[PDB]
Structures are given as structure tokens and as C-alpha cells.
Design an enzyme around this catalytic site. Sequence first.
Site, mmCIF file in Angstrom:
data_model
loop_
_atom_site.group_PDB
_atom_site.id
_atom_site.type_symbol
_atom_site.label_atom_id
_atom_site.label_comp_id
_atom_site.label_asym_id
_atom_site.label_seq_id
_atom_site.Cartn_x
_atom_site.Cartn_y
_atom_site.Cartn_z
ATOM 1 N N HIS A 1 0.767 -1.226 0.000
ATOM 2 C CA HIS A 1 0.000 0.000 0.000
ATOM 3 C C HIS A 1 0.822 1.315 0.000
ATOM 4 O O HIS A 1 1.930 1.380 0.529
ATOM 5 C CB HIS A 1 -0.757 0.106 1.337
ATOM 6 N N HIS B 1 0.974 4.620 1.863
ATOM 7 C CA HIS B 1 0.506 5.268 3.063
ATOM 8 C C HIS B 1 0.588 6.790 2.871
ATOM 9 O O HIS B 1 1.238 7.363 1.981
ATOM 10 C CB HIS B 1 1.294 4.786 4.251
ATOM 11 N N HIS C 1 -3.317 4.418 5.277
ATOM 12 C CA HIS C 1 -3.381 4.328 3.840
ATOM 13 C C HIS C 1 -3.784 5.670 3.240
ATOM 14 O O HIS C 1 -4.590 6.400 3.810
ATOM 15 C CB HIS C 1 -4.355 3.246 3.300
ATOM 16 N N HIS D 1 -11.250 0.513 3.264
ATOM 17 C CA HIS D 1 -10.183 -0.285 2.657
ATOM 18 C C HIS D 1 -10.772 -1.324 1.707
ATOM 19 O O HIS D 1 -11.733 -2.015 2.093
ATOM 20 C CB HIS D 1 -9.428 -0.973 3.798
ATOM 21 N N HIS E 1 -9.328 2.561 -0.718
ATOM 22 C CA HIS E 1 -8.426 3.698 -0.477
ATOM 23 C C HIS E 1 -7.705 3.982 -1.779
ATOM 24 O O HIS E 1 -7.490 3.050 -2.575
ATOM 25 C CB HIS E 1 -7.446 3.259 0.583
ATOM 26 N N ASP F 1 -4.630 1.585 -1.815
ATOM 27 C CA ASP F 1 -4.787 0.134 -1.733
ATOM 28 C C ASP F 1 -4.370 -0.570 -3.017
ATOM 29 O O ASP F 1 -5.172 -0.679 -3.949
ATOM 30 C CB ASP F 1 -6.258 -0.197 -1.449
ATOM 31 N N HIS G 1 3.861 -5.052 3.714
ATOM 32 C CA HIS G 1 3.480 -5.594 5.005
ATOM 33 C C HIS G 1 3.812 -7.055 5.290
ATOM 34 O O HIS G 1 4.097 -7.888 4.443
ATOM 35 C CB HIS G 1 1.948 -5.473 5.074
ATOM 36 N N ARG H 1 4.686 -3.476 9.127
ATOM 37 C CA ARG H 1 5.305 -2.936 7.912
ATOM 38 C C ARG H 1 6.737 -3.428 7.870
ATOM 39 O O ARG H 1 7.472 -3.059 8.782
ATOM 40 C CB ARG H 1 5.255 -1.406 7.989
#
Lengths: 151, 151
Positions: B44, B46, B61, B69, B78, B81, B118, B141
Amino acid sequence: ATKAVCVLKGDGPVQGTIHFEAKGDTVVVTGSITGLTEGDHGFHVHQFGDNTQGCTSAGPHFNPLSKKHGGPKDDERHVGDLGNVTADKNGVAIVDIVDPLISLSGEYSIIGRTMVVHEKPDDLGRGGNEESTKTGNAGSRLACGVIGIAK
Amino acid sequence: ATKAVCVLKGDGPVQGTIHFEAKGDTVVVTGSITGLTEGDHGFHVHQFGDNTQGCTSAGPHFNPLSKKHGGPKDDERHVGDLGNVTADKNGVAIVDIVDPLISLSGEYSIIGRTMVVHEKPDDLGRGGNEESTKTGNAGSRLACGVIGIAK
Ligand SMILES: [Cu+2]
Ligand SMILES: [Cu+2]
Ligand SMILES: [Cu+2]
Ligand SMILES: [Zn+2]
């Protein structure tokens, strides 16, 4: 974007955190850099936010108006020319700059570009050789980071 | 900017280089991440490009339209995403995503924001809990970097 931040890292002991804030019509740059040798170190915004080859891939000074290198108070300078930061005897440089050419959105934006602190003093475009007119003879890139949007 | 790049780094062995390219109203993201445990890992954009506290200062995000999400193919998602990346048994994930929501300019610009890879797979908002609709349960993360402008 109103606030930006950069974390400086390199291959040696030099490191630091730089903050950028849009205040009124200008940008204020504050922070501090540690691990430096005493004296002045060139401090500039380089064009690319590319750290794939360390600080080398940041490219040359951010220069959208295609000028020659200068000091921060000259009219003839690159947009990325922020002059020198000065380290004390402990290796600590305190950064406190207001600059009228960069900022945080539009054509002059430095978001996504690279902040670099250099090995030697920036001679501000007056060393008298060609190199002076490009880099101020500031030498090698000790530490750098991509400028990001901050909260 | 029509080109961008991100170098992913973290506290452990995960490392990688992501390239971004504008193509009409799309953004093509390519590259590869190594050191990953085989399987699916959430991938993702952020909100902040702040690495002052590692990957945790990247915030949540990128969600300018305050949606829930989702996965890349969904309409309710998002902007950041990008679903999942899949690592082989060697620990290598080859990235190849084409996306119509993220961009390299304008209001949904990701330049200066953080790319995060992640611990666990993104459940794309199909998990049976609250967490799933905020982060897809992707967990910690592993690595991240600020997205910068590239040549
Ligand atoms: Cu420089
Ligand atoms: Cu995430
Ligand atoms: Cu999300
Ligand atoms: Zn210059």
C-alpha cells in the site's frame, strides 16, 4: 502540502532530520545534522528523489529556471541552492533558513526531491572555475534523503 | 512528474526498488522486492512521506476520498490500496501493477508519500472484522520508502 520532512542518511556517520514549513508566502527550513567535520558544508536540493544509487542518483541541483550556481541571496542561483550549514566542534549543525525560491507545491516544489549535505564548503558560484558554476565545488555527498509530505 | 521511484528498506532483510510510470490515465508500477516470506504481502501507499520513526510515521493508507479499505479492483477502496504482492519460495516478489486511481500529479499524487510492504497478506476488506475494513489485516510494515521524482 504545508509541511515536509527529510531524513538524511549516507554511508558514513552523517545524519539528520530536516523540516520544511510553508509559513505565509515562504518556506522555513529547520533541523540539525550530526557527525559532520567542523566548518561549512554545502546544503542543496538536488533534482531527483532517486536513492537507487545512494546520493549519486539524486542528479544535479534543482534548477527549473536554468541558471548557474550561486548563494541563497544571489539572483543568479539554482532553486536548490541553500548555501552552507555550519557544524560546531562537536560536528553538530543547526539549520535555520527562510528561502524565497523553493516551496511545497507547484513548479518550484521540492516534494519528492533530494536534500543533500556535502563534504566541503559551497563557494557560492565564485571559485572562478567551471565547477564553481555548477556545484560550488562542494564535493561529495555525505548524506541525503527524499523530501516527503509530513503531518 | 511522469516518472517516480521508491527504495524499500526496513529493520530486517526486506529490500526492494519500485518504479512508477504515467501512461495516459494509468500508473504502471514495476520492480521487485526480496527477503520476503513466500506468499502474499499487502502493498500500500501510506499517507505521509515521514520516515522519522521508521515505517510507523507513514500514517495510514492514502485515502483522500475517505473510503473503506478494499482491493485494487474495487470501487470502494483507499487510493493507496494496491492489494497484494506475492513472494515465491526464494523470497522474491516481482511487481507488475497497472492502476487507474494512484497518480504522479494532481490531487491524488503519491509523490512524497510512503510505499509500504506488510508482514501479512491484505485480506482486501473481506475479512470478518473491523480491522479488515481499515487495513485489511496486513499486519506490521516490513519495509518502506518515500516515493521520489525520477529521471
Ligand atoms: Cu549539491
Ligand atoms: Cu498498508
Ligand atoms: Cu487501505
Ligand atoms: Zn547549485
